[PDB]
Ligand binder design. Sequence first.
Ligand SMILES: [Mg+2]
Ligand SMILES: [Mg+2]
Ligand SMILES: [Mg+2]
Ligand SMILES: [Mg+2]
Ligand SMILES: [Mg+2]
Ligand SMILES: [Mg+2]
Ligand SMILES: [Mg+2]
Ligand SMILES: [Mg+2]
Ligand SMILES: [Mg+2]
Ligand SMILES: [Mg+2]
Ligand SMILES: [Mg+2]
Ligand SMILES: [Mg+2]
Ligand SMILES: [Mg+2]
Ligand SMILES: [Mg+2]
Ligand SMILES: [Mg+2]
Ligand SMILES: [Mg+2]
Ligand SMILES: [Mg+2]
Ligand SMILES: [Mg+2]
Ligand SMILES: [Mg+2]
Lengths: 117, 60, 206
Amino acid sequence: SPEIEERPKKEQVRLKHELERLQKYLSGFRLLKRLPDAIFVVDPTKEAIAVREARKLFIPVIALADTDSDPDLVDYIIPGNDDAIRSIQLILSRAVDLIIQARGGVVEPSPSYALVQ
Amino acid sequence: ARKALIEKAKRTPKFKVRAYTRCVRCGRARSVYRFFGLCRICLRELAHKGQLPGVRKASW
Amino acid sequence: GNKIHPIGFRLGITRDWESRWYAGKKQYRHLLLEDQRIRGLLEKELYSAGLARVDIERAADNVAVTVHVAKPGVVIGRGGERIRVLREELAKLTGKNVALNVQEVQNPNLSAPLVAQRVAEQIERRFAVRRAIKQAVQRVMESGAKGAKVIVSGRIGGAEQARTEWAAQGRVPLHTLRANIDYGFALARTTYGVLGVKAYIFLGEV
RNA sequence: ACGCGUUAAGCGCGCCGCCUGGGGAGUACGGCCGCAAGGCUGAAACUCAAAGGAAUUGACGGGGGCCCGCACAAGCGGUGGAGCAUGUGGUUUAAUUCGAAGCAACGCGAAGAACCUUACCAGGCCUUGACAUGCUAGGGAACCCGGGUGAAAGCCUGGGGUGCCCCGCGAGGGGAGCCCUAGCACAGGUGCUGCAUGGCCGUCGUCAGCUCGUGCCGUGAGGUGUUGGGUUAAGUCCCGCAACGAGCGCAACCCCCGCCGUUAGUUGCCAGCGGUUCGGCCGGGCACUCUAACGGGACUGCCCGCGAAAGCGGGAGGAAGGAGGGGACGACGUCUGGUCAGCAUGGCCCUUACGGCCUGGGCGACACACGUGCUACAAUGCCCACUACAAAGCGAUGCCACCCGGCAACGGGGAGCUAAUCGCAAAAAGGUGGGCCCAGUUCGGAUUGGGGUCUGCAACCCGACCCCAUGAAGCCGGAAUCGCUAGUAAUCGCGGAUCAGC
Ligand SMILES: [Mg+2]
Ligand SMILES: [Mg+2]
Ligand SMILES: [Mg+2]
Ligand SMILES: [Mg+2]
Ligand SMILES: [Mg+2]
Ligand SMILES: [Mg+2]
Ligand SMILES: [Mg+2]
Ligand SMILES: [Mg+2]
Ligand SMILES: [Mg+2]
Ligand SMILES: [Mg+2]
Ligand SMILES: [Mg+2]
Ligand SMILES: [Mg+2]
Ligand SMILES: [Mg+2]
Ligand SMILES: [Mg+2]
Ligand SMILES: [Mg+2]
Ligand SMILES: [Mg+2]
Ligand SMILES: [Mg+2]
Ligand SMILES: [Mg+2]
Ligand SMILES: [Mg+2]
């Protein structure tokens, strides 16, 4: 913008640091602009506040869950392993296969190996 | 008394030293700034409104 | 009992005077007394029109008197029948040649002293003291303001114990000099004593 | 509800004991038991509209933890003592007008009480009224000049006077202005109620707070956010967190002061050079100084250390760091705070008087008590003389240079200045010399006698100033107690507002 040059002194931090946090939490959340139709949760005990809200609103709850958690309040459960980067990976990815594969034209098994080890 | 008196103070009197000021609004004897004919009260009032030209909050 | 007048707080900036005439230290006194009995007469016989500011200028035996109103029609009369009567009434006290512009306040819900008057008017016609406030603010926010706030004093609804109703919306930052906050005050002489109406409208900035 | 929760206060079955508002009362009576102390069983009359339980928000604690502020400590100067000025309490008065009451009343409203002011008293007076708008009615209708009387107000008076509507009349009557008297609607009241009020103010407090929206938690009041960890002057920022945001606040946006630049030359100057009766005064020059407008400059931007971050300690550069220094600026609310006597205003009260006008006195009383102040009590001082330190404001019913008269206040004259130009204006402390020599003093300047000057109609009650005389208490102040953290305190003079003078 033209105002990357102007704005009072104490506002190219005040405003630009506000954008930092908004960037930090609302990176992926910036996309949906009506409630979703489902939620995929990794550890529903860790992520209990989220599940709560879903159910409250009758949004179904998919989850990779394990011995940690109460299954009864997961609608679609994948009994696995909320901890292993392997497990989260195997499942999270193949589920995103189906997601594109319901729309055609799948891609590779994904950039999904951090410095995996 | 403050009617018969707003009147009396305008009458030119025997002897000029019987004469005196009065807030031409708020009809009043004491603290009456002669540069305005205005009682300190009925004055702070105008001064605030903008009805006294060039007069301003002093701050130094 | 705290708090300065928001106009007076701003006169040098974000608000200029209701009288822009120089004088030496021996005219000022009289060019004021006149200046005032002017507004004393104008405001009194001109309530119907609804006057905000009564601006005034001078330049030696001529006077500007740029009266701002919501209803120009009412000061003029169909053609020019009243505006004549007024120019005529003025020079009988003002021994000088009284000029006289007239202005429309394009939106009267953003003129604070009009909003005050409005609410004060309602109160004298025993209206719902608390909803008047509520509505008035709304109206003002509705005509696109940045904030507003209205205050009425006490004996609300002829009650025995004085009280104080207020309501407000958006921002009304009374401490910011660069705000532009039209303020306004109306009386309200009722059967059971005076109430006091204050009104604040935030609009401005840099 | 707190909580319980396989050691139920959960879900069920069996059997026992017990409760049925509080006080009277575990009392009275009776019975049983007991050595006794007493125990068990256990009422009523009368009487209350509650008595209770758990939890909520506060507030409080001679509970806890964290932290601030001239809060105490550390200091320097004060008050309480004396004289005097001033405000107040009390008393006194014909009256000593009213208000203000711990902080947050008491050099407060009063930024100017001799008459004015003035709201108080005593006396002489006016009543449709000193002021606004109208009505009913005979009288005159614009107006001018005296006299009597009185302290003045007012009152009793004798003259000068005929303009304008109208022509309707060629002989002038009709309340057109205007002015009178007699009635009427009304004015007037600083009379009362700040506990009927507006407004404006004070105040906790410039304290770091007070809230809202939606979401979430609780049956609920409410809670969460606003708790927690770090940090700040700050609910300031940071990190976390069923919250996410926001508003009134904080800060910033505004004024003054520190450094520099631009624009500008009746104030600045040998800065440069020239003339100078050697006064920036003269031509000349804005360089400088200043004046006043507009910009720049500071950001934790830069370097070292700590920290997750905010930020913290230190360093450089810079006139100026980490809020550079002083203002302006006062959240939701609190105090039934303050003011009806500035004004405005609901109600109640006075209307030949609770209104008005005047002269005079009073607000200035003085056996006393208190607050705030001044001047002191001396040699780091007092007195006299000489001697540029410079720095905000006022001044044409004014500031008054300069001459002269007077010891002087002041009085005569008299130039300049609507004022960066001329005046008030001497700054004082300081500096240089001289005096005093530790004394109730050459300290101190109360009180008092006398002579004056000025403002003002007028200075007895009641002014300030000058001059002679007179020189009081006072030798640093009991218990108590006040301010101030830096250009501050301490000290020294200077100006203004109000205002004839004070
Ligand atoms: Mg006077
Ligand atoms: Mg348990
Ligand atoms: Mg009972
Ligand atoms: Mg309890
Ligand atoms: Mg409690
Ligand atoms: Mg101490
Ligand atoms: Mg004393
Ligand atoms: Mg009173
Ligand atoms: Mg009150
Ligand atoms: Mg009030
Ligand atoms: Mg009172
Ligand atoms: Mg609920
Ligand atoms: Mg904040
Ligand atoms: Mg804090
Ligand atoms: Mg601020
Ligand atoms: Mg009270
Ligand atoms: Mg008198
Ligand atoms: Mg007095
Ligand atoms: Mg001695």
